[PDB]
Paper text:
Vps33 regulates fusion in the endo-lysosomal membrane system as a stable subunit within two large multisubunit tethering complexes, HOPS (homotypic fusion and vacuolar protein sorting) and CORVET (class C core vacuole/endosome tethering). Vps33 shares the overall shape and topology observed for previously reported SM protein structures. Following the nomenclature introduced by Misura et al., Vps33 contains three domains: domain 1 (residues 1–138; red), domain 2 (residues 139–248 and 502–667; green), and domain 3 (residues 249–501; blue), with domain 3 further subdivided into 3a (residues 249–380) and 3b (residues 381–501). The C. thermophilum Vps33 and Vps16CTD–Vps33 structures provide a first detailed view of an SM protein from the Vps33 family and of its recruitment into a multisubunit tethering complex.
As an alternative, we co-expressed and crystallized Vps33 with a C-terminal fragment of Vps16 (Vps16CTD; residues 505–834). The structure of the C. thermophilum Vps16CTD–Vps33 complex was determined by molecular replacement using C. thermophilum Vps33 as a search model and was refined to 2.6 Å resolution. Vps16CTD contains an irregular α-solenoid made up of 17 α-helices arranged in a manner similar to HEAT repeat proteins. Vps16CTD binds to the upper surface of the Vps33 arch, opposite the large cleft between Vps33 domains 1 and 3. In so doing, it interacts with all three domains of Vps33, burying about 4800 Å2 of accessible surface area in the interface. The N-terminal portion of Vps16CTD lies in the groove between domains 1 and 2 of Vps33; the majority of the Vps16CTD–Vps33 contacts in this region involve polar rather than hydrophobic residues. The contact surface with domain 3b entails a mixture of polar and non-polar interactions involving Vps16 helices α8-α13; the long α10 helix packs especially extensively against Vps33. Interestingly, three residues near the C-terminus of Vps33 (residues 655–657), which are disordered in the uncomplexed protein, adopt a well-ordered conformation in the Vps16CTD–Vps33 complex. Nonetheless, despite the extensive interaction between Vps33 and Vps16CTD, the backbone conformation of Vps33 is almost identical to that observed for the uncomplexed protein (root-mean-squared deviation <0.6 Å). In the Vsp16CTD–Vps33 structure, no interpretable electron density was observed for this region of Vps33 (residues 334–356), suggesting that in the absence of crystallographic contacts the tip is flexible.
Residue numbers in the entry:
A (entry chain B): 520 to 597, 605 to 791
B (entry chain A): 5 to 212, 218 to 270, 296 to 333, 357 to 546, 556 to 582, 600 to 657
Write the structure that this text describes.
């Protein structure tokens, strides 16, 4: 009991740790390594405790010390079962769920990928301290690539991996009707978002018949001013000049700039 | 007799060449890729050739030249990736050559017990001459020192790896070993305190067994000022508005170089006369600056080609700043920074996501929201998170979680998001910087400031003064800082005196430790510094030119995009 006490204040705070370690004085050796700020020392203690202590005992010691916990966590990411065990026993369910999501991104098929997402959702259930969003998100993710798989089977093009917005964009650009509206409806994409995507897609498609058809209605959730600007560049100044004066909320001084840049001097 | 950034380069240059001659004969050189950049700052490839270097190679490329016998590896010691790579490089040549081949390894800056094991558990340890290359600070400029740890922000704040703090402490201690102890160690932030604690511990360990002499205070160094990056996330999150700042934003700058459209490499340092004047200037006057220079030349050879280079660069940056997306980004940034209701900027953010603006730019806005408003309202939070997921991928469920761990994107109901107040009792040892309080108390918003002839550091953001630099002014320019708020404020003592109430509302511990012609002050950034903060420091350095020399030290040169990339998941469900 005495031999441990005398080392607690001298000398080089880096050679007291191997001495503490041989005396089976763990934690104290780890605390001294942490307070030294020496990464090399912290690893040496962790690697020693990893091989000597049971994983359970190893976790407890390491979990109490955020710096030591970080290194074990860092070493495993570059091990997977170790990460899950660490997070579960420390009740870190969001971190554990992230491991399964990270595994889903590595699955060669969406079937196996969605199975990994399901495992992530399982972790977030129980206790569930405000995990409603993540559970719905993993639900959408499983929903999305399942629909995108149908598109690849039918349209013989690539869709799996794109976001909801990117999926809508590619669908509209290829002129695939309400298939994009089906995606939009299923994922509850806001009106202002969906119309920006549709505007950008039709412009990049130069589908000025559809744009003119869209101009043939009254209200616009994003306004008609975006329609003016988007069509003017890389497109018709003539079709752009259609949206004026539908642009409700305007300058109001004056209107000239729009009629001016549309070639009509 | 004082400190000089050139002696750092000189020491770094002779430390390497001494080791390159330690290996007798000719040699092939294999270097860690992200180390090759910083190495170019201290030594040219021509000089290395004059010391027996045949060909150059990269560690990650795994194709070491079989040519010369001597195979010299140069990499960072604390790296886990490198220890396996070199071992796998030896295996992939010890049984894949024809001649004996000698193996030399130059660790930076030290040989680690970890690297000993990795080579031990590979068997290739016995066949290697291990040498130590004490490289720390890379003098990018005469007034800028950098450890060049381009992953230090991620490691320190996301991975909680204390390695950059330890390396910075050794680098700072190295200066004390030569020029004497820092009379004062002034700082703000948890990692700033950790550096101060290490300087104290390393000092007392230097007394060791066998007793050593000890160190006396410096007579050429005034003090050291240490600022933790996590104290002010807002500044780097904003879009930099200086010329060099916008280059870093648009093109990206690494090792005093950038890539404009394989691609052409443009040198960006103070050696160029024209760039020395352009780099710190607000971009709004660059065009006029370029016009004046061009007219003077037609009315001293490299300046002619430099005029063409920066006319091309500026023209591209101008084209980028004219886009609706850019101005929309600035609009949200300015409103949030000014103090407007964050909820009013929702439709603009929603539009930007809808227009598919680059993810980092969107995340920077969300983090600016969270970091400046003390978290995000619960109802708006899920709406923001939903936009990101279905706008860029559900994979970014990890990205948002990482930003949460970084405490840069939090709910208002979260205890980690709460800003420091004096009304809401105590609670929260890691309560965040109160920008609402600090905006007024430190004049973070200056809508005056002309950009043709700036009168305040707020010119680097066209009206916004960086909190980080404002805290530096609490120590260095107390009279001026009071002047822009008070007036009639002996007077010139060090420390946080006069502003202790204000700094109290900033994140992390506040400290001012006393260790027992003009002098130099070291302004140290732990976690990264932006070019705007550098430009702000240079502005101040010009004002203090007669009384102080200012040298900037940092772990790396950081920006908004580098911070988001520390969190952004790149795998994409394909």
């Amino acid at each position: 009991r005495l031999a441990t006490e005398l080392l607690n204040h001298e000398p080089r705070a880096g050679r007291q740790v191997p001495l503490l370690l041989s005396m089976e004085e763990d934690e104290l050796a780890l605390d001294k390594a942490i307070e030294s700020g020496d990464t090399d020392l912290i690893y040496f203690v962790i690697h020693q405790l990893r091989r000597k202590l049971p994983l359970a005992s190893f976790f407890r010691v390491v979990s109490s010390r955020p710096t030591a916990s970080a290194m074990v966590e860092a070493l495993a990411r570059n091990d997977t079962a170790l990460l899950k065990d660490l997070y579960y026993q420390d009740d870190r369910r969001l971190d554990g769920a992230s491991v399964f999501i990270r595994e889903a991104l590595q699955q060669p098929e969406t079937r196996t990928a969605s199975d990994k997402l399901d495992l992530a959702a399982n972790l977030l259930q129980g206790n569930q301290k405000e995990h409603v969003f993540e559970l719905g998100a993993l639900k959408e993710a499983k929903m999305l690539l399942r629909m995108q798989e149908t598109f690849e089977r039918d349209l013989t093009d690539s869709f799996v991996g794109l976001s909801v917005n990117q999926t809508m964009f590619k669908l509209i650009k290829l002129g695939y009707h309400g298939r994009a509206k089906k995606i939009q409806s299923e994922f509850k994409v806001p009106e202002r978002v969906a119309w920006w995507i549709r505007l950008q897609a039709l412009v990049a498609k130069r589908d000025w018949n559809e744009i003119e058809e869209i101009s043939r209605q009254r209200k616009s959730p994003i306004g008609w001013e975006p329609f003016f600007n988007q069509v003017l560049q890389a497109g018709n100044p003539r079709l752009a000049a259609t949206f004026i004066p539908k642009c409700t909320n305007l300058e109001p001084g004056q209107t000239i700039t729009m009629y001016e840049k549309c070639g009509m001097r | 007799a004082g400190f000089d950034a050139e002696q750092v380069r000189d020491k770094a240059r002779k430390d390497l060449l001494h080791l390159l001659e330690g290996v007798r004969g000719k040699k092939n050189l294999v270097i860690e890729k992200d180390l090759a950049g910083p190495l170019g700052v201290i030594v040219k490839a021509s000089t290395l050739r004059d010391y027996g270097v045949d060909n150059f190679f990269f560690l990650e490329n795994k194709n070491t030249g079989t040519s010369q016998r001597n195979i010299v590896f140069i990499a960072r010691g604390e790296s886990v990736r490198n220890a396996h790579a070199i071992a796998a490089q030896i295996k992939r040549i010890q049984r894949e050559s024809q001649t004996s081949h000698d193996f030399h390894i130059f660790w930076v800056p030290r040989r680690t017990l970890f690297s000993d094991k990795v080579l031990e558990e590979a068997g290739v340890l016995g066949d290697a001459n291990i040498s130590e290359l004490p490289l720390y600070f890379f003098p990018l400029e005469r007034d800028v020192l950098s450890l060049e740890l381009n992953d230090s922000f991620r490691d320190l704040y996301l991975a909680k790896d204390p390695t950059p703090v330890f390396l910075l402490s050794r680098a700072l201690m190295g200066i004390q070993k030569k020029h004497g102890l820092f009379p004062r160690i002034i700082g703000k932030g948890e990692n700033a305190k950790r550096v101060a604690d290490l300087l104290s511990r390393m000092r007392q360990e230097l007394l060791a067994e066998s007793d050593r002499a000890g160190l006396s205070p410096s007579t050429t160094i005034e003090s050291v000022i240490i600022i933790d990056r996590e104290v002010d996330f807002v500044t780097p999150l904003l879009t930099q508005l200086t010329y060099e700042g916008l280059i870093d934003e648009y093109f990206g700058i690494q090792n005093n170089q950038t890539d404009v459209d394989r691609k052409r490499k443009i040198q960006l340092d103070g050696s160029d006369s024209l760039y020395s004047q352009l780099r710190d200037a607000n971009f709004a006057i660059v065009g006029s600056l370029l016009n004046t220079v061009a007219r003077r030349l037609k009315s001293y050879q490299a300046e002619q080609q430099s005029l063409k280079i920066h006319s091309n660069i500026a023209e591209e940056i101008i084209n980028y700043t004219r886009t609706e997306i850019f101005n929309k980004l600035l609009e949200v940034q300015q409103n949030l920074a000014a103090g407007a209701d964050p909820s009013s900027q929702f439709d603009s953010i929603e539009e930007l996501v809808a227009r598919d603006t680059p993810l980092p730019q969107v995340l920077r806005l969300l983090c600016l929201y969270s970091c400046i408003s003390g978290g995000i309202k619960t109802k708006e939070l899920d709406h923001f998170r939903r936009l990101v997921l279905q706008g860029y991928g559900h994979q970014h469920l990890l990205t948002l979680h990482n930003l949460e761990r970084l405490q840069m994107f939090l709910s208002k109901s979260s205890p980690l998001a709460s800003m420091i107040t004096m009304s809401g009792s105590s609670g929260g040892p890691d309560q965040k910087t109160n920008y609402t309080y600090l905006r007024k108390q430190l004049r973070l918003i200056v809508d005056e400031v002309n950009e043709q002839d700036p009168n305040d550091i707020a010119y680097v953001y066209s009206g916004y003064a960086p909190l980080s630099i404002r805290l530096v002014q609490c120590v260095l320019q107390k009279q001026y800082l009071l002047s822009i708020t008070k007036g009639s404020g002996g007077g010139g003592a060090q420390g946080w005196k006069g502003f202790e109430e204000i700094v109290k509302h900033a994140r992390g511990p506040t400290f001012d430790e006393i260790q027992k012609d003009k002098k130099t002050v070291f302004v140290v950034f732990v976690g990264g510094i932006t070019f705007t903060e550098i430009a702000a420091l240079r502005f101040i350095a010009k004002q203090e030119e007669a009384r102080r020399n200012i040298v900037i030290c940092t772990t790396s040169i950081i920006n908004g995009n580098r911070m988001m990339n520390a969190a952004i998941e790149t795998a994409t469900f394909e």
